[PDB]
Structures are given as structure tokens and as C-alpha cells.
């Protein structure tokens with residue numbers, strides 16, 4: 122009956138708040154202080170939260186969701202029936218929790234050392250080398266070295282991780298873990314929807330690829346770049362070649378129109394990692410959206426500590442399911458790239474504050490992609506020359522194509538990589554890719570989608586996916602692909618609401634209450650309604666669409682077509698078999 126069902130939801134909500142609150146603190150202390158004490162406290166708080174999940178998930182399965190009128194009640198109960206890892210028998214649950222902890226630690230503490238000297242960490246050392254070095258062999262030292270230490274050591278944990286995470290999914294009614302992850306979007310046509318979105322950005326990516334390949338051919342020499350083959354994976358300014366903005370000096374369309382060194386501008390004018398978040402806080406409030414509580418500033422780790430303690434550096438935002446406690450954990454470097462990431466993480470916090478009045482089971486994004494997109498939308502406005510100049514970090518047709526090129530190196534280059542990652546994982550989860558095919562099938566997709574090849578031939582024992590944070594940390598990736606598509610849809614819609622006329626890329630939504638109002642009401646929905654409703658609240662239409670992204674970059678697509686045609690470039694990589702000598 123309906124009456125017992127709403128009572129159960131109320132009971133679940135109160136008990137979840139307390140137990141979810143306790144787990145968050147226990148997880149925080151490990152993430153901000155990797156030791157042995159905090160690790161086993163987390164392993165024991167894992168059993169406490171699993172008891173709650175098992176207890177209430179059993180009760181939920183005794184409810185026939187099928188016989189329930191109120192859809193909000195119907196929705197929550199259906200979610201509680203999913204136990205996740207808690208569905209596993211005790212021995213396998215503790216094994217699975219240990220493996221995850223082992224993988225997360227292995228990744229976070231891994232270092233790449235010189236013959237008998239300095240040992241380098243991923244952030245900021247190896248990140249800095251990948252971004253600034255222009256020597257082929259030095260970049261290779263960092264690229265290979267990171268994969269030799271982080272990737273290779275993850276390989277031992279991964280098959281059993283796949284086995285146990287799939288087992289949990291089967292016990293919760295799914296065929297495998299990929300199926301379980303995809304269900305978060307509540308869209309039966311998701312795979313075909315994502316494929317069509319990817320195909321629509323092919324002409325824009327292939328033109329950026331061909332142009333960047335030409336620029337690399339210019340600098341690294343004809344012997345190391347094949348203008349009809351895939352680009353060596355280590356030359357794009359980033360460890361995973363997911364974003365390419367750091368090789369801007371190598372690709373700048375009009376060097377005739379030069380732009381400020383934005384990193385040294387920040388360091389000189391006295392930009393603290395604290396001021397970087399303070400300015401991101403200002404942008405949100407200018408839209409009429411909520412400020413971060415005083416408690417946020419007291420308890421957040423906005424900078425890498427000098428204790429000598431190990432930490433999880435990857436940027437993340439933290440909801441304590443309290444309605445009062447919200448935190449950010451980030452190893453912030455003072456540069457433009459981390460200012461964007463600071464806005465991204467503040468977007469998560471805003472989403473937390475907007476739906477804190479909802480039940481905890483519904484305290485979630487419309488879909489995971491929505492949660493990632495909020496900060497990135499504001500960052501698009503922050504990234505404009507007009508907003509950056511007003512922050513004294515910069516000082517028109519040539520500057521216009523340059524800016525669009527800068528944005529393309531991040532936004533466009535990430536489309537194929539963000540698509541790639543879960544294309545690999547889903548096939549790993551469903552059995553298409555086994556442990557003897559992990560690395561081979563990873564590079565097949567690197568070639569197929571990104572048009573990248575490894576700089577060094579891959580050997581047995583290589584597990585390059587393990588050198589990317591999200592893989593050993595078991596964090597789904599397709600969200601970022603959705604985010605990059607939809608953030609431009611949000612941008613377009615918020616700019617038309619702001620009354621911005623002219624080219625989309627010159628829009629700055631700063632201080633627009635109309636743009637804030639559309640964001641607010643959509644975020645307030647949380648996970649109460651299917652995402653097409655939240656999409657419609659912001660954009661006036663319910664579909665994911667690549668139109669807004671192509672509109673934004675339309676001036677660049679025309680310029681690239683002309684430029685690549687006059688060089689007689691071949692779009693794509695007809696010689697997919699090509700690897701370096």
C-alpha cells in the first residue's frame with residue numbers, strides 16, 4: 122500500500138543522513154591524509170554504511186514499486202533496491218573494498234624517479250613537464266615513466282575489481298557494471314544518442330587534429346610526425362592528451378597577434394589558490410546564486426599540504442549530506458588551467474546547496490553530466506578575453522581566431538577522449554575485452570577516436586588505462602563527455618536569456634540574474650525528475666544537442682577548413698597502422 126511506502130521513504134531519509142554523514146568524514150580523512158590508521162577506519166565505516174544499505178535495501182525490495190501511485194515515492198524506493206557493493210557476501214565485500222583502497226593508494230603515492238636523484242609526483246611535477254617541456258625525449262621520459270609506475274602496478278588489482286564490481290551489478294539486476302553505470306542516465310537510447318553527438322563533432326575535431334599535427338610536424342620534425350598518421354600521444358601538453366591547451370605556443374594561428382602569459386600574470390599580481398576560489402564564489406553570487414557557507418572556508422583543503430603526508434590530489438567536491446557542510450579537495454596550482462577547475466568544483470558545491478532541501482536519495486544531479494557542467498558553464502564566461510582582461514590576466518579578428526583556437530584545444534580535443542574512456546570500460550565490463558586485451562584494445566580506441574598512437578610500442582605488463590585517475594578510482598567517465606556537449610547548450614541558452622546578441626563565443630553571462638534563475642530552478646529539481654525536464658528548464662528543449670558547440674566554434678571551423686585545404690592536409694589517419702621509428 123501507498124501509506125507504508127511513504128513512511129519507509131521518511132525512515133530511510135533520516136537514517137541515511139546520519140550514516141552518509143559519518144562516511145563522508147571518514148572518507149575525507151583518508152583522502153586528505155593517506156595513512157594506515159585512517160585507511161582501516163574507512164574500511165570499517167564501509168561496513169557500517171553497508172549494514173544500513175543492506176538493511177534498507179532488503180525492505181525496499183519487499184515493496185512492489187509496480188503498485189505505487191505517487192511517482193516521487195515510487196522513484197526513491199526503486200533506487201534503494203540497488204544495494205551496490207552491499208549486495209555482495211561479507212568476504213567478497215571486504216575484498217572489493219580493500220582492492221579499491223589499494224588501487225587508489227597505488228595511484229596517489231606513485232612516483233617517477235631519476236637514475237639516483239629526484240623523485241617526481243604526478244602533480245605538479247609530471248604535469249608541469251608534460252605542459253612546458255618541448256623536448257621529445259623528456260616528454261617521453263615523463264609519459265613512459267608514469268605509465269611504468271602507476272599503470273603497471275594497477276594491473277594486478279584490476280581483473281578481480283572487474284569480477285567483483287560485475288558481481289555486485291548482477292546481484293542488483295544488471296548484466297554488468299557498465300549497464301549499471303549507464304542506467305544513471307535513465308535513457309535507453311543513450312549509446313546511440315552519444316554516438317550521433319560524437320559524429321556531429323567529427324568534422325570539427327578532424328580539422329583541429331590535422332592542423333595541430335601540422336604544427337607538431339613543424340616543431341618536432343618530419344621524421345617524428347606522419348602527416349597522414351596518428352599523433353604521438355605524448356606531444357599534446359597533457360599526460361593523457363585529453364586537453365591540448367598547453368601546446369598553444371606551438372599552434373597559435375596568428376602569432377602576429379600575441380597574448381599575455383596568464384600564468385606569470387597570476388603569480389605576479391599575487392593570486393593565491395584561496396583568491397582563485399574567492400573569485401569563483403563571486404561569479405556565482407553575481408548570478409544571484411548561493412554563496413559558500415563560512416564553514417566551507419574553514420574546513421576545505423584548497424592547497425597541497427607541506428606535512429609530508431600523502432593525499433589524493435585529483436580535484437573533488439564534497440557533500441556531507443548535512444545541508445551545512447560542503448568542502449573542496451584540490452592540489453591547486455596558480456595558473457589559468459586550475460582557475461577553470463576551481464570554477465568546475467564550485468559548480469558541484471552550488472549544486473549541493475541548491476538541492477539540500479530534497480531527500481538524500483534525490484540529492485544528485487539531473488544526470489551525472491549535469492553535475493559536471495554547472496561550473497564549466499560559468500568558466501566559459503570567465504575564459505573570455507573581456508572577462509580575463511577585467512581580471513588583468515590579458516590585454517580583433519586575429520585575436521578572435523586565437524581565442525577560439527585556445528578554447529578548441531581544451532573543449533574539442535576532449536570530446537574524443539571523454540567518449541573513449543567508457544567505450545573501453547563498458548567493453549571490459551561486458552566481456553568484450555579481457556585482461557590479455559586491456560592495453561591493446563585501449564590503443565585501438567585511442568587510434569580510432571582520438572587519432573593518437575603511443576610514442577613507444579606497448580609491451581606485456583602494460584596497463585596504460587591504470588595511469589588515468591578515474592580507472593583505479595572507479596569513477597565513471599561518460600559524464601564529462603555529456604558535460605562538454607551540454608555546457609555549450611547551457612551557455613547558448615543563458616546568453617540568449619542574458620540578452621547577448623552577436624557571436625556566441627563573445628558572451629559573458631556575469632551578473633545576469635536571468636541566467637541565474639534558469640540555473641537555480643533546474644538544480645533544485647536534483648534527481649526528482651528525469652533529466653530532459655531539467656534540460657528543458659534551462660534550454661527550452663529536452664534533447665542533448667551538439668548544435669550549440671558547433672555554433673560557438675563555427676568561426677573556427679571555417680578558418681580551419683581553409684587553412685587545412687591550402688596545406689592539402691588529409692583529414693583523419695588513413696594510415697592507422699603508423700607508429701614512430
Ligand SMILES: *[C@@H]1O[C@H](CO)[C@@H](O[C@@H]2O[C@H](CO)[C@@H](O[C@@H]3O[C@H](CO)[C@@H](O)[C@H](O)[C@@H]3O)[C@H](O)[C@H]2NC(C)=O)[C@H](O)[C@H]1NC(C)=O
Pocket residue numbers: 191192193194479480649
Ligand atoms: C508525492 O509525494 C511527494 C513527497 O512527499 C510530494 O512532493 C511534495 O509536494 C509539495 C507540494 O504539494 C512540496 O511542498 C512545497 O514546499 C515548498 C517549500 O520550499 C513550498 O514553497 C511550496 O508551497 C510547497 O508547500 C514538497 O516540496 C514536495 N516534496 C518533494 C520531496 O518533492 C508530491 O506532492 C506527491 N505527489 C502527489 C501527486 O501527491
Ligand SMILES: [Cl-]
Pocket residue numbers: 361585586
Ligand atoms: Cl594512455
Ligand SMILES: [Cl-]
Pocket residue numbers: 302305489490597598599600
Ligand atoms: Cl556517469
Ligand SMILES: [Zn+2]
Pocket residue numbers: 465466469492493
Ligand atoms: Zn567534476
